[PDB]
Nucleic acid binder design. Structure first.
Lengths: 638, 20, 87
DNA sequence: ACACACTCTCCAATTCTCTAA
């Protein structure tokens, strides 16, 4: 430790607010590079430099005050570009070994400190001025390299994640990412991103600008971002008072129910009762030791602890939570997003698609391209501008491209067991983008223009005639798994299914019959494929969280369930004890008034069950087990 | 078969000085 | 030593399982139209009672998961063919 | 003689893999 801490001091010293470099500072930073060139795989030199806080202590003063020496400026920039490179790229993965895990965490800690240190607007200002000078040349390879490393420096600074677990800030407060983003605006560096994105000859930089822009907007979804306006202050104030009111009210109500359930006399007042005629697990009647009031809602299991699960038996879970940034940041982001869509989207997408098609040996990350089209199409649609603003993406090639990518991800998720989690994440991203394409063609039907309506019919015609889009949903439902994907994937999949069936039904109405890739089609025959009992199990799992599901989610799932049960007459497939337990809890909750469709559907299907049970007593056995299609149909025959 | 299939098949600048 | 009890297929097809189930409901009564909620409460009450006969260790939801898994085995189908129709 | 804290072991439950119904 002491060796580096002693030698690194050579760069200079600070006098009040004036920084004085040493006369061999350049040779000194060259020695720091020589240290890094012979660093250990644990990244020990980087941890030592971080402990010595060289970047915060000397490099920021050198860049702010001594940048007139362009060779020294170049040396400092490249040094900190190597130092700031994200930990996942340095180690190659999050390490399995505890020693390397500790080193990774420590390196990432120093990177977090560097990100906080970089928040000074003066650095971005100098960087933007330098970059503004470089682009005026219409240059040497070293000039291009300086542009490259400037872009990569801000990329690396943005890339290292914020520790929301450390910050624990309330909504509308600024995180480290938020403050740094605001500093980008305050420096004017954003204007250069829009120049680079809009200028045609800068296509080589546009691929980097895509990563920069997509890194900035991560915390804000485009729909709520499009929602913002100057009156939001009073809106949030009044709404928060209302939210606090209902929260307090709910706790009061629940308390009183518990208070009435408990007896009034103290916990040692005693007593004992025999439930005459109710036999035990043993040969004789049950003896009950608890208070008299408890028998009003008795179930024998109330005394039991839950079953202890094995470690490897646990399902997947979310590592993320919804947020909103400070109103200043929200307004700035909305302006930037509007200006990017206005000036840059189609040109940048054409450039990025060109690079992804041409430059396959370079292994560029396609997920950013899909993220950007998924984000900006949603923003454009939320603002309901003319479809011309997103013209480039409105073509069949996008559907085929994302289908082959999504099916590749699906096949890899199945085959490449060692990376199935990441393949599932990639597949989920692709599904999200595809849902936006469907929403876009649906929206232009309700436009006033016949030309775009005809274009919509052309796209939808190809999508429904070809096999892949109508087969894909069944392929995903067939291989959904609790370890493989969290429930968010299932929500997206079933909602996309409802939208696909809606547009399919509307398209089938155009002619006496639809012919498809070759066979005469039948909508009811296609829906019969979803009568697989595994699909119903997934639907029931999604239904357990109906109070936490969105209103749109609940509408979509209940609509599809009623259609499948009623019109296909497959009703007996829903006669299940797990479902009946959920129905019992549903009808017991006093909040049932909010869920009229669900309770009426539940009472309807239970009516069918009790009507059958009155005739046939075997239903009480069938209720324990899942049905094959033949059994579902045979139960009505008896 | 043939007629529906046939008819359904047949359907198918600014400088950097300006910004900054 | 270590004679841990657990609910397997042979226990599930024993008398306290499906046979007892077949006979528990023939004494019950149900009210039907406009009373489906109460009938469901009665049904679940008897079902929790029956399940506690078969294996008094698990919670009711955990027990249902075990039965849902264990229903796959051919051994219970050999008994199901008797419970359905007659022995 | 009768309670905590700690260390350690062996039995068999859960999953991978190959096979037949």
């Amino acid at each position: 430790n002491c060796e580096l801490l002693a030698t690194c001091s050579a760069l200079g010293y600070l006098e009040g607010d004036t920084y004085h470099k040493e006369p061999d500072c350049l040779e000194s930073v060259k020695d720091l590079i020589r240290y890094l060139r012979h660093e250990d795989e644990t990244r020990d030199v980087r941890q030592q430099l971080g402990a010595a806080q060289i970047l915060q202590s000397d490099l920021l003063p050198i860049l702010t005050q001594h940048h007139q020496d362009k060779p020294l400026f170049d040396a400092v920039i490249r040094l900190m570009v190597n130092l700031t490179q994200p930990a996942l790229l340095c180690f190659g993965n999050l390490p399995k070994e505890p020693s390397f895990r500790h080193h990774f965490l420590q390196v990432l800690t120093y990177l977090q400190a560097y990100k906080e240190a970089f928040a000074s607007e003066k650095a971005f200002g100098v960087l933007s001025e330098t970059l503004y000078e470089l682009l005026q040349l219409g240059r040497q390879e070293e000039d291009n390299l300086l542009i490259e490393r400037i872009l990569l420096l801000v990329r690396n600074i943005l890339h290292v994640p914020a520790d929301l677990d450390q910050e624990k800030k309330i909504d509308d407060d600024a995180s480290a990412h938020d403050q740094l983003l605001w500093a980008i605006h305050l420096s004017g560096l954003d204007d250069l991103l829009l120049f680079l994105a809009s200028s045609s000859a800068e296509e080589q930089w546009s691929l980097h600008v895509l990563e920069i822009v997509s890194l900035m907007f991560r915390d804000q979804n485009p729909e709520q971002l499009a929602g913002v306006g100057q009156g939001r202050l009073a809106q949030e104030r009044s709404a928060d008072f209302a939210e606090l009111e209902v929260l307090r009210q709910r706790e009061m109500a629940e308390k009183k129910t518990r208070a009435l359930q408990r007896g009034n006399r103290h916990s040692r007042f005693g007593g004992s009762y025999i439930v005459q005629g109710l036999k035990s697990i043993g040969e004789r009647d049950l003896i009950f030791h608890k208070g008299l009031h408890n028998l009003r809602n008795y179930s024998s299991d109330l005394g039991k602890q839950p079953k202890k699960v094995p470690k490897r038996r646990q399902a997947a879970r979310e590592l993320s939570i919804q947020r909103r940034s400070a109103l200043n940041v929200r307004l700035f982001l909305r302006d930037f997003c509007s200006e990017f869509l206005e000036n840059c989207y189609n040109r940048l997408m054409g450039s990025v698609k060109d690079h992804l098609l041409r430059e396959k040996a370079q292994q560029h990350d396609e997920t950013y391209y899909m993220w950007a089209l998924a984000f900006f199409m949603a923003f454009n649609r939320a603002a309901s501008f003319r479809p011309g603003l997103v013209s480039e993406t409105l073509s069949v090639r996008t559907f085929h491209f994302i289908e082959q990518n999504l099916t590749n991800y699906y096949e890899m998720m199945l085959t490449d067991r060692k990376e199935a989690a990441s393949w599932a994440r990639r597949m989920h991203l692709a599904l999200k983008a595809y849902q936006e394409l469907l929403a876009t063609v649906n929206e232009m039907d309700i436009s006033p223009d016949e030309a775009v309506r005809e274009s919509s019919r052309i796209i939808k015609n190809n999508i429904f005639y070809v096999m892949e889009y109508r087969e894909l949903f069944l392929a995903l439902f067939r291989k959904f798994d609790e370890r493989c994907q969290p429930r968010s994937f299932l929500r997206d999949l079933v909602e996309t299914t409802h939208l696909f069936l809606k547009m399919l039904e509307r398209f089938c109405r155009s002619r006496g019959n639809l012919v498809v890739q070759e066979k005469e089609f039948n909508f009811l025959d296609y829906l019969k494929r979803f009568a697989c009992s595994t699909v119903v199990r997934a639907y029931v799992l999604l239904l357990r969280s109906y109070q936490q599901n969105s209103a749109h989610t609940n509408h979509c799932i209940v609509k599809m369930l009623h259609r499948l049960a009623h019109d296909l007459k497959m009703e007996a497939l829903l006669f299940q004890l797990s479902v009946f337990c959920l129905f019992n809890r549903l009808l017991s909750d006093p909040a049932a008034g909010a869920y009229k469709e669900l309770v009426t559907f539940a009472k309807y299907i239970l009516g069918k069950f009790f009507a059958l049970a009155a005739v046939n007593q075997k239903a009480f056995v069938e209720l324990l087990f899942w049905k094959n299609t033949a059994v579902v149909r045979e139960m009505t025959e008896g | 078969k043939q007629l529906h299939s046939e008819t359904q098949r047949l359907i198918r600048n600014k400088t950097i000085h300006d910004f900054f | 030593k270590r004679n841990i009890p657990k609910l397997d297929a042979q226990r599930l097809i024993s008398e306290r399982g499906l046979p007892a189930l077949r006979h528990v409901f023939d004494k019950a009564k149900f009210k039907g139209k406009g009373h489906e909620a109460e009938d469901l409460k009665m049904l679940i009450r008897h079902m929790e009672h029956w399940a506690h006969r078969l294996f008094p260790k698990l919670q009711f939801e955990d027990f249902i998961d075990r039965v849902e898994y264990l229903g796959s085995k051919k051994e219970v189908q050999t008994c199901l063919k008797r419970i359905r129709l007659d022995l």
